[PDB]
Structure formats: structure tokens, C-alpha cells
Amino acid sequence: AFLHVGKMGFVVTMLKLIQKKLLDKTCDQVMEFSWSALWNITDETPDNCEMFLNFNGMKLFLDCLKEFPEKQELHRNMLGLLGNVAEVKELRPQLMTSQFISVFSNLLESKADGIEVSYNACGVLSHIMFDGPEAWGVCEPQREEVEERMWAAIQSWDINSRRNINYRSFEPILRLLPQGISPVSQHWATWALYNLVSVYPDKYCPLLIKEGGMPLLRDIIKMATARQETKEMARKVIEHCSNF
Amino acid sequence: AFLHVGKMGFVVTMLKLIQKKLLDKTCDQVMEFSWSALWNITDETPDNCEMFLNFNGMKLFLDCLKEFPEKQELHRNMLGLLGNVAEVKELRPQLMTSQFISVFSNLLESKADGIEVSYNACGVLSHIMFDGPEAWGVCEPQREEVEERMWAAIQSWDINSRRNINYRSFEPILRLLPQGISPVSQHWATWALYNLVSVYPDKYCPLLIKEGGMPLLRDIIKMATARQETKEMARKVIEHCSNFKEEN
């Protein structure tokens, strides 16, 4: 258990501490904990994502990225937090700026913490791209260029990567499967499931099955808008889950 | 998504800051931050609980309690942390000393931060009681005296108490339902659910339902050996949850 984050204003407490550490130019264990705490308290918790944005958290994120460009765990934790923010459809419009899209697109090539920074940045963009081209009112980083960078990132990851992430539910990922608005978001989501059932089948195969992932992946194989590579990946995900 | 992983260097860093603030005799925001950070990182994370104990956490706890006997926020943070430690079965043997049991039992009557200190002390003791009488050994006070104080504490709390707690999973509470070793621990766990579904149904009815709490509570009501007062609380939880699905 933990305290009541809303009543205690814990999101604000963390962001104030991050601001103090950033001014002292220190990325120590306390700085990294503060971001790790924000990542963890925003999991499936939109009110905490909303409070992060309303307390100017995006500015602290960008300033920390620039002041600490080689701090890999810091980058992982910050991008995990933003991955949770990006799952909230009502908050995504706040991510649709050239400043923010450029950062996420640039992080697709990050080699920090193995694949975690690239993966979480691709997740952020996958939820953004799911809203369709009308939602992309940003002129610089063109949508098609970011999309091609997302395909490049996904294909570059080792499918047997061990991972510094966990999911209590696959529902935000599964929501990217039954749609043709954004094939790249569907491909990211299929890769996410494939990697997890490949490397951690005992935890993630039962999770994927219980939440209805199998019919969703079968539908991908029959889906006109899905790319050949996504259909091939989806059949293999079914493959490992049936063995289970 | 989330990441709940042990971090030896951070547990060590937090314990060192607490020890420093202890020597300074100052329970400032940093002292509260450090204990609340330990509470946060032990949530659903047994590895950080194990590291806390390996790096002398119990002595720091006792010393902070003795140095700062009226600081309610500190007590709430420390007992929150210990509540997470006590969920780990392999770590509970390290809590079985007369020194620690007396401290926890004497917190059952605490009025610090509403009910939070008394509630978390009772939770620590509920997981301890679940281990049975052999684990208690010759620890003092006697196991039956502590059990009676736990019953009394539970009945003293307002069932509609507002709370300074959050659960992301009820797993450690549900673990105390399908067992007959410790009736008081089953009662504490049923109370914990009853309070949360009474006061925060929109959050906790869906969690309890999704995590399989309904069959466990139904089983308590059908168990011939369960205490009627616990059966009636379990029934009220089922009633509240069944009502919840109606509204939605």
C-alpha cells in the first residue's frame, strides 16, 4: 500500500523535488526515485497524469532531458511516465506540439536503458497516431516522417530483449489492435505483446489470454489494413500462447 | 505501465538520510520524505522490504519512534512502510521479538493520522498472527492478549473513516480471507475491504470484483467456523459491491 496520492498532493511533492534537483544540476538517486515514483503512480491513473501536466511537468521533463542527456535510468523513468500520460485520450492534445513531438520522435533512436526509452517513446507516439491525421495539427516533424522512424525503431529492437517494464493489464495495448487508423500503432502494440510473451511467457501469456488478446490477434491476420509483417508477428504471438 | 523493482542503492541512501536526521534530532521534510519514499518503493515490492531489514531498518524505526514520539505524520509513514514489510512471509521471522511485538501492540490504540497508525499496526500484527502460534514462540506480550487488543482496535474504528491509504491490489488482504488459522486476521481484512468499499466504492468495488474477492467473501459466510461478526461484515461488502454493479 501507499498514502493517498491525491489528498497528500504527492505528484506536486515529487515535481517540487525534481525542480530543486534540476536547479542544483544533480541527477542522484533521489532525482531518479522522484521520476520513478511519478511513473508508478500514473499507471492507469489519469488524475495523476493530469496533475503532472497541470503542474508544468512537461517543462521539467524537457529541462531534465537537456541537463542530463546521458542519464539512462532517468530517461527510462521520464518516458515511462509520459507513456502513462499518453494513454489518456483527453490529455493527448496537450502532447501535440512541435516541441514535444520532436522530442518523442528523436528519442525513437535512443539506446538508453537497452530499448526502454525508444520503446516508451514509440508507445507515446502510437497512442498519438491512433487519434488519426486530423489530430496532428503540427507542421514540423511531419506525421509520415515520424511514422517511418517508428517502423525503423520497432524493427531494430531485439525481440528477445529482457525488459525494465511491467503491465498490470494489457488493455491500453490491446486497444491499438482492432483498428486501421494507424497500422504503425498496431505494429508497435503487436511487438509489445510478442516480446513479453516471448521472454516472460509464464507471466504474460495468461494475462494476454484472459483479457481477450487471442481473437484480437486472429482478426489482425484477416485485416486488410494490417501490414504483412504485423500479420506474421501476430500469428507467432498466438503460437506461443497456444503452447501455453 | 510501471516498474516495481528492488533498488539497493536507494534503500541504502534513504536509510542513511534517516540516520543522519535522527542524529540531528530533526524530523523535517527530508525525514518525512525518506520514510514516505521507503513506503512508496516497498508497495508491492518485497525486494525493497528485504533490503530495508538487511540494512538495519528496524533499529532506525525504533529510534525514530523513541526520538519523535508525537510526530503523527512520521508515525504514519513508518507504519505504512512496516505494513508493506509485514506482507512478505519470508521476512516476518525478523519481526518476532518481544521488543517489536510490544511496540506494534502498543500502537493499536494510536490516534495518529486518524486511524492510519492503528490500522497499519493491526495489519502488521494480522499478517504475523496468520503465521500461527509456533512462529510467536516465547515473544511477549502473550499472543492472546495481542489478539484481544486487535479485536478492540478494529471495533473502535469508524467504518466510514476517511482514509490516507491507497491499494493498487488487494492481494495481501485477500490472502487473509481463506484461512482459519487467525480469526482476528480475517476480521481485520474484511474490515479493510468494508471500509474502502463503503467510502470509495468507485475505486474499490471494481478492484475487489476483478481480483476475485466475491467468492472469498461468499465462502466466509458459508463457513461454519467463521465468526458471525465477520460473516456480517463480509455480507455487507458483497451487498455494497452487488449494488455497485447496479448503478453501473
Author numbering:
A (entry chain A): 514 to 757
B (entry chain D): 514 to 761
Sentences reproduced from the published study:
ZER1 and ZYG11B, the substrate receptors of the Cullin 2-RING E3 ubiquitin ligase (CRL2), recognize N-terminal (Nt) glycine degrons and participate in the Nt-myristoylation quality control through the Gly/N-degron pathway. Here we show that ZER1 and ZYG11B can also recognize small Nt-residues other than glycine. Furthermore, we present the crystal structures of ZER1 and ZYG11B bound to various small Nt-residues and uncover the molecular mechanism of non-acetylated substrate recognition by ZER1 and ZYG11B. In conclusion, we propose that ZER1/ZYG11B not only targets Gly/N-degrons for proteasomal degradation, but it also has the ability to bind a defined selection of non-Ac/N-degrons by a conserved molecular mechanism of substrate recognition and target their degradation through the non-Ac/N-degron pathway.
In line with our SPOT-array results, ZER1 binds to XFLHVGQD peptides in which X is either Ser (KD of 1.3), Ala (KD of 1.6), Thr (KD of 3.1) or Cys (KD of 3.9) more potently than to the Gly-starting peptide (KD of 4.2). Structural comparisons indicated that the peptide-binding modes of ZER1 and ZYG11B are similar. In this cavity, the main chains of the first three residues of the bound peptides are coordinated by a set of conserved hydrogen bonds. The free α-amino group of the Nt-residue forms hydrogen bonds with the side chains of Asp556 and Asn597 in ZER1 (the counterparts of Asp 526 and Asn 567 in ZYG11B), respectively. Furthermore, the carbonyl oxygen of the Nt-residue is stabilized by two hydrogen bonds from Asn597 and Trp552 in ZER1 (Asp 567 and Trp522 in ZYG11B). The main-chain amide and carbonyl of the second residue (F2) on the peptide hydrogen bond to the main-chain respective carbonyl and amide of Asn679 in ZER1 (Ala647 in ZYG11B). Besides, a strong π-π interaction was formed between the aromatic side chain of F2 and the indole ring of Trp 552 in ZER1 (Trp 522 in ZYG11B), this observation is consistent with our SPOT-array results that ZER1 and ZYG11B prefer an aromatic residue at position 2.
